Amino acid sequence: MRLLNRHSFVVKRKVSEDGYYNDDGDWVASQDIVEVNCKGNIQPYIKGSVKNGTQIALPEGIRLTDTRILYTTYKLRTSDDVEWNESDIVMIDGHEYEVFMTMDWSQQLAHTSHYEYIIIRRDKMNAVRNSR
Amino acid sequence: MQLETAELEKGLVRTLVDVIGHRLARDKNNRPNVIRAYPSDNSNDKGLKPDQPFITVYCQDAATPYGWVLDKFVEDDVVCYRIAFQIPVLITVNGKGAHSIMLELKQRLEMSSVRDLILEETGATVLDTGAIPNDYTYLNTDFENSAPLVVTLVKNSVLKDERGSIIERVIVDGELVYEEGQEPPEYTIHLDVDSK
């Protein structure tokens, strides 16, 4: 419906699910990454000690943590060790948001079936590769 | 040889695949499940928990209880230093029968063999091996049996001091005097010695 499609964002799904552990023990993420276009709705998540755009003071400097809730009809998936697949990524404001939680309301009713996700801004860190 | 825990962990992981690989589960590539702790790639990707039973290798820290510097020598014109290090490592088995697997792993690290393979790969010697507890953690639904163990290693690391230099020429001067402070010296000896 109209309100469920107010926002348009990009989603990076690792289509391949062939991640494995090297002969040295390091983790190697699935190789084939694919970009997609999706539509949904993004709002701040107000609950308990959740931190939306909260500035954090540390001895090392300053951080910024954010988290949101997303309503959409697209089936995004989080990490699953039994099915052996990794989570998706959602691009908001040019930054990455990793899908951490999911709530399956699909197949409940005709016109109001949807999904809910809690997406957390990814922390800043340097990059390293282990590919075999 | 330089000391780097990133290489010690890799060597231990490669050795364990052959030493105790027959008791563990195997992945889609038929490789036994041995991994380094806190798996991650590309600075944010996170690895999944393998199928049990598996092993995890995690280096705790490094210390220098044996003085501060072991040797200082010249190998080529560049100066060199040698330092003795000690590295405790933690190996854990997760699954069912973790204690039964850790016991056999203990009984194999003490053999005359295996200790040679470890030195062949990592270039380090096994110094000690602690006791094995029998832990249970609830997780959700069912408990998980685990069995940690600590294996301490010893290694020598060498570094190159690119700022150093060597003395190859010496110039010496001397005097002789009947009495202290004789302003005009009785005799003066001047000497010069080259390496060549």
TrEMBL record, chain A:
This is Uncharacterized protein.
From TrEMBL, chain B:
Pfam families: Phage_tail_terminator_9 (PF23961). Residues 42-175 form the Phage neck terminator protein gp12-like domain. It comes from the Viruses. NCBIfam families: LIC_12616_fam. This is Phage neck terminator protein gp12-like domain-containing protein. It comes from Escherichia phage JohannRWettstein. The lineage of its organism: Viruses, Duplodnaviria, Heunggongvirae, Uroviricota, Caudoviricetes.
